[PDB]
Swiss-Prot record:
Belongs to the protein kinase superfamily. STE Ser/Thr protein kinase family. STE20 subfamily. Serine/threonine-protein kinase that plays a role in a variety of different signaling pathways including cytoskeleton regulation, cell adhesion turnover, cell migration, growth, proliferation or cell survival. Activation by various effectors including growth factor receptors or active CDC42 and RAC1 results in a conformational change and a subsequent autophosphorylation on several serine and/or threonine residues. Phosphorylates and inactivates the protein phosphatase SSH1, leading to increased inhibitory phosphorylation of the actin binding/depolymerizing factor cofilin. The gene is PAK4. Highest expression in prostate, testis and colon. This is Serine/threonine-protein kinase PAK 4. Interacts with FGFR2 and GRB2. Interacts tightly with GTP-bound but not GDP-bound CDC42/p21 and weakly with RAC1. Interacts with INKA1. Interacts with SH3RF2. Interacts with RHOU and PAXI; the PAK4-RHOU complex protects RHOU from ubiquitination and acts as a scaffold to suppport paxillin/PAXI phosphorylation. It comes from the Eukaryota. It comes from Homo sapiens. The keyword Secreted does not apply. One of its GO terms (cellular component) is Golgi apparatus. Residues 23-274 form the Protein kinase domain.
Amino acid sequence: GSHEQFRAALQLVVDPGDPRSYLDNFIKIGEGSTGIVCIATVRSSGKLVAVKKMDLRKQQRRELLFNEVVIMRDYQHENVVEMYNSYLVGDELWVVMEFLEGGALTDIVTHTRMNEEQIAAVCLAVLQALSVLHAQGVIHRDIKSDSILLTHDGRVKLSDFGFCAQVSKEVPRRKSLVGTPYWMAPELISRLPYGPEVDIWSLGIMVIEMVDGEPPYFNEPPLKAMKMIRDNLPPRLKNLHKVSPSLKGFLDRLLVRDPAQRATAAELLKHPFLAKAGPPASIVPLMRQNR
Ligand SMILES: Cc1nc2ccc(C#CC3(O)CCCCC3)cc2n1-c1ncnc(N)n1
């Protein structure tokens, strides 16, 4: 019983019982990597939460469902979406978590143009979370604007660890073709054993998003694009002229074709460009209901 074995394994990691008993008023607010995301009210407290529901029978790699619940279950960090509980409901795994009322970064990078103070602020937060995460040996593996959620007061949180993986002192690196094509590191598309460095490349691609409004090759079909990324040199900004030398210098320590030469999260935190980072209040005017 393959399906049933997965259920039983999951029942060993999730909190027991039916969460529908204590949740009111479900409202769908998105699609995730592995399932859909709703918000609901906690009947007792009146609080709002977000709920990620993943169907066990609808997964390409069902084993990936252990990632968030095993790897992220206890995690806490100012810049990482906080998980509250997990449950098994019918054939679905549910993750109950913090609701980020500000929506995703994607909506901002496709509707406005961020200044450099705001860009560095997003970059600072993400890198802070990546430094701690990469230290514990957790690779996100799907960094992009969709994975960046905001609070009402413009605070930034890393999200959707549905594709994450674990590396250790005994086994660092993965050989897995995971992520979103346009944002994938070259050594990953080249099927090479890769480590945490693939997140830094991806953050670089997200910088291009914040500057150009889209990633490189975004018009090409995903299979073709991955090849162009695999074959060509580090991509160039369509708006290099709107960008300061500092941001360029920053970006250039991220889009290194050589993973060994690519900068690290811990390194990038000390970079001068991040001195431009503004307070979370600087982000607020970019959000939809304010613009
Ligand atoms: C809209 C949306 N899509 C999501 C996909 C994955 C995760 C996710 C996730 C996790 O991987 C984070 C780390 C703990 C385990 C769940 C969260 C998503 N949200 C969302 N969530 C909360 N608020 C808002 N506005 N939007």
